[model samples]
Target: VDTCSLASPASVCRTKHLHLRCSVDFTRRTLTGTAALTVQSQEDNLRSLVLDTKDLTIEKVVINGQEVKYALGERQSYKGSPMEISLPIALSKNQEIVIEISFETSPKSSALQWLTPEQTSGKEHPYLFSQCQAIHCRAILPCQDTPSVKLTYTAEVSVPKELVALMSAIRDGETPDPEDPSRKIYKFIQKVPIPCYLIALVVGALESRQIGPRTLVWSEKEQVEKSAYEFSETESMLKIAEDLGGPYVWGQYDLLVLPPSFPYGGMENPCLTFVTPTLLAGDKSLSNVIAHEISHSWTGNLVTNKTWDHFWLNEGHTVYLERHICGRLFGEKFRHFNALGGWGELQNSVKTFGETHPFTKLVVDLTDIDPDVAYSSVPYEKGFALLFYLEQLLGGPEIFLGFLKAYVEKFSYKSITTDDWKDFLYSYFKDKVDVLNQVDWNAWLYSPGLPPIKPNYDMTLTNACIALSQRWITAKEDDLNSFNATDLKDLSSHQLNEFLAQTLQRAPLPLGHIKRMQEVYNFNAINNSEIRFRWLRLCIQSKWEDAIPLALKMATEQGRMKFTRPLFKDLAAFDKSHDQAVRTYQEHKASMHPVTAMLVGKDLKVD
Candidate 1:
């Protein structure tokens, strides 16, 4: 058994295809349906198979149209119970068959969150969303919860006529039920093979607008226009990524702007990328997140890692590709500017987790534990650093870009482990074997703490940002008259974010400087969430009491752990806003996603 997956026994009868038909019941907050699994016997004389499940009620099981005997095993913490089914006769190798399972999801299903009608934006229909990363997918469906296996799937989702249902697949068509006009059956075809974790489904009041020939942006009616405008450059990003990587095999690229309660910036779910609404900056300054998710089209969704331990293969490569995409769209200098920022984040994460912590290693151990607890930016930033280092060592982007294209092409729609990647690298670079032989692959992949090859970023773009922060520090050292708002004219939002972030790390400015900076710059009104988050960090650090209310509003408005965790912690520690921070968090905990609330509660030391 793989240490991370609790469903390894199911590999005996690996799934090849799934035909799922479920009915959503908002009142019970449950999804009742039948999942028909087409499985192939991995070995001859396999008597039975086991599937992973959590908080699921299995009503019946039928094999080849005959009733089968099955029982739910004892529940394990975090891993859930395994459903073992006995066969009337042992199966032979290469024997293919179908198993139909009728089950209903529980209200406490870790993957599903059933929001009340009042919690939704329209305040009419209840919303249901699922986050099934790590091991949570087992709670939604009984399957082999591992990335090593991929299967094609088709779903027939029946929802209320007033609502819409979506999945991580090609949107074939929606058909109304002939028997019941109040119900509509949505059909989707995920013709491409994908891991169980990539199977996404959402049901709510949704509307769509055509953004490109094949691209559509979906959200509530109130937000369709704004989401479209913010992600208007999605088609261009796709074209650039296609040129760098391989063709987009998922057919069409669409975006779904989810409610603010979505815990992540974006989830790269195959055809439909689920994103948080907070990215709708009026000026589109924060739209780099779109580029990041788009890069995942090549690195993550297309070529996946075999296990969670090698997660860096998915994230680090994507972050590196994201920088390349951004460099192409923006200037070349912008690449290193973003990398320098990421370097800072990597250093901070190392410091927070401690250099000796096992979780800080690029390859982590998920044995008998939840991978979610070890989730951090280390894999993403560190993995990017390693890839970027290899690029530089292997003679710059021209050579490395070719390698990246070849890598994706070689393993498209397949899962590989870290050793598989190493072998491929050696084969791909046989001509430069002498240069590759000098590198130490063992330490980089398994050793704890940061990589030895620290990247040297070209600071040409951020030099101005650094100098501007220095100017602010000089002004604070004097009586604030040394710097003027006019001196900072025509600054980009990214530069401003850099300036504010750097200034926050420097010596504490007088309260007057903070006040005057806000009055002149109006960072409080900045449309960019990144810039606004940095300004709020500076406010909390310098104890700018006037910004406390703004901080409270921001923490409650969006539930991204990136912003809420630090803001809540820092604001709660400040004497002036301690009680308000606790009160505000308590009042808005229901509005935040469960994951966000769990993390923020620990940040505020709340019960």
Candidate 2:
């Protein structure tokens, strides 16, 4: 037997070196491994080695090869039972560390069960892997339980007999395993290094497709075609990213589609990306997910964040780079920056809290980790908006591009803190901008909430949203109605829904604007499912009794999941049983067409 004896705290790998071997079956989405661990301390270091655990239970523990006093310990620093067993072991620079831990995972978690109910709904987990988003780190492997330390990891995973393994290798290749009838272990050697949180693995049903030089992959069988279509432009986008910054320092690139249960849209997990079906809009029209994930190739993936507290460094920089890369790739008219207006509009809408909290409060400024506060409510939307607006305020497109490129090149494979980021931003505009020089960077950081925007920009977006409503709802022969677009202009569906609600609130619909609305939508020439849904909603509010009758002929289940479907069923039921849903949509719910039952149903509200 290999004798690997050592101490803990500084470098835990010494103890983990003696952890059990691994078995992985990529196709079957199953892995089995043992986690044998020990904790010890010397005059210089306190160390613990966390072995890879598939699905594990603590079988036993040993101190200096003998069973001794063991206690289940819980500290503020630790999330799981780290099994605080002090070892009668000593440490020397000359000795390697050791431990033997055993664990097993059948592509499932007690927290996140395997993808068992695929037919239930897209909201369910339909694939196998780890959902180590929040506390799953402890579930997968044991650690001292903080985000500061940077560890070098070598994972040998064994998958079932049929499936192949694809992971964080610089080169994406194919192979089969020896001895095992149905399993293969992938060698994912991430040389650049990554935080435990950002590191991920997906062993499930996957079909990796080809797109030019790169391989495009997805866990869902139905989503492969759309993922292929949407990501075909990745090569050109990467070209633009390279021209602006330098070449990507990370290895081969591949898009991995996680099933509907994926926690988020996309995660740039080095070579192996984690994506959700939400990114697939059935067309190449979806650009937000594409742009965001690609920017991580430089920001989040290239220069890792120092701590979870400074998540803005990874996310904000990636967002800044997204606007630049899009501008370069698609050019002005066919641009992706249109998505910026949506976020700007949202920041303007939050008038309730601005009276007491600073605008920086709208932006993320967290020091300690609070899982409930960190979800979509904190970092995702607000962070993207504030960073985009900040980029505009500090530097127009050109200056921000220069700052982003420098940040990536300067910190490639190196780690950085939030202050380090602000300093770098200052270096680029040293003599040019003095506002940044006097700014209280730490105060803004430690202070929570949306960072305030310039009053003029905030007011402009507020006025813009109001102006959009006036043009759509109050257009008359005298009203030129400048806001109408003949094409499928990219606009926020959220804003569209808001505009629809404002118009709905006004009953006995105005007859004067109907002609212009018809012209703008081109509904007279061609009729489709999405447009029908829009029309059905417009007429169902009692304001459009005139329009409801016109849309009924087109209401079919063939293409009913879009915007029109909900309104179609609502109007039809209300018309058949009027005044039944004055207080709510449930009274007419029993009579709704099968297509609209779930959307306007009371049971759907818990979603």
Candidate 3:
């Protein structure tokens, strides 16, 4: 059945030739299934199965209620999504069969939705889930499920009574009522056409805080109140997501917080989003992550991409909307610079990785692509940057927004090809041919190289910085003490953050410009803290001073994720010379991500 055209009177597909029955318990990652079907004569009638880990050992395999247990192979190993499997078998399509498979799920290693050791221990432990998109889905379900091939799944999940069960399918009913829910054996049946990966299951001791239009749910062990704060933002997000593209048509939107171990920040699974614990932010700005995730309603969720390689079609466009919203709500400097900073990082990453690990060599074909790596921030940040450039070339936001709506309406529900995107775009503005056609889109997609950044960008920025600094050169000392809005623009991203980093070679610092300079002076000292970092970088090199304190203040107060964390670590040592800064730096350090303890291990400090 083609997804583009739902049947006229609403299609009801008769149950096909195959009916799958399966059960999974997070506590054990166990699978005991009856592959009941009619099959022909079979030689070595053993079916293959995938588990979270290679340690999955098959106990007894009963066929037609008869024991045919045989030794299973050593668990298969993979880097992308951890999965193990039973050996393959030869069989026909005319015999009834029942297979029993069971295995243990490590608190640390199980793949479906991994719970931290701490999360698994207590009675109210968060058996929170992460449907390993790349792992447990295609390999375990034994259906030819990929992004393009959508199918419905009926999965029976049994968890500790008192734990609630959630899945992508239509929820007939959860064990306990919303008032006072209990953990009991539960079954999740999803009726929508779904890719195996998007078919999610989450089980945990859940608690919810009622916000305006949504209820934010979490495990009793964590801070649901904090999660509530972030969840509160979802309403506006839904509004904007719809405003930008289309309304979130999925039933109910629930935010589910799983035990840490999720490598990605969030997953857009139908009406519910499986989130990393880190998102329950005290800073509140982490709502950008929520915004990005919610924006997926229009991009990732509504207009699904056909292949992992085309994932950017979803993420990049959503992030573009995210930054656009951020700028309108916050400040242009806040939104655009933030977006650009990520782009700069991607430029570096593409230059770094694309050079070392060419896409052609790293990935020969579509099958070689691992959904996890392809769909991550690499695609998100880089893809957003690509669209950012396209927007800039398309005469910026207003036109871009119009173009976005057009793209969505044209392609919604249809499996879109990359060629389809290029053709539509080129056709839309055929009048603006040079800029649109010559774009180095293929550099990152089909070739391996960071396209040359516009030649005039660096020069235009350098000149802007000089004039911005000189505007204050003649201001009075008392006036220098007082700052104004332009000073901030002089100091940071006005629209796209192109002003954030300007070289001293073309733009020299004025003598008293250091004293007259306000926020501009602080741009550099706040490295890692994007606002302060950009502000301090320009301020110091431009010989701007008064803004440095403001930089330190904003750096300590407003940063998030690695940007603030790494800056605090650097400031701790830098503060010894400035006693006042020592206190501010230490205070900031105290507020690092609470759930960061579960973050994947990485060495980010390049120096």
- lDDT per residue (tens digit) for residues 224-292 in model 2: 777788677777777677777788666567788765434445667776666655555544545556667
Please give the ranking of all candidate structures by TM-score, highest first, separated by commas: 1, 2, 3
Best by lDDT: 1
Off by over 4 Å in 2: 1-31, 35-56, 60-71, 74-78, 83-88, 92-100, 105-113, 117-126, 170-180, 332-336, 345-369, 377-395, 438-450, 455-468, 473-607
Estimate every model's Cα lDDT from 0 to 1: 0.85, 0.50, 0.51
In model 1, what are the clashing residue pairs, if there are any?
A: none
Please, what are the lDDT tens digits per residue for candidate 3 over residues 457-554?
Answer: 22333345555444454455556556555455433333213344333222334545454444444433433223444445444445444544654554
lDDT of 3 at 128: 52
Cα miss at 96, model 3 (Å)? 17
lDDT (tens digit, per residue) of candidate 1 on 469-522: 887777744556656777568678788888887897773677888887877777
**Using Cα atoms with residue i matched to residue i, what is each candidate's TM-score against the true structure?**
0.95, 0.67, 0.62
In candidate 1, which residue ranges exceed 4 Å CA deviation?
A: 9-11, 474-477, 507-509, 583-587, 604-607
The candidates, ranked best first by lDDT, are: 1, 3, 2
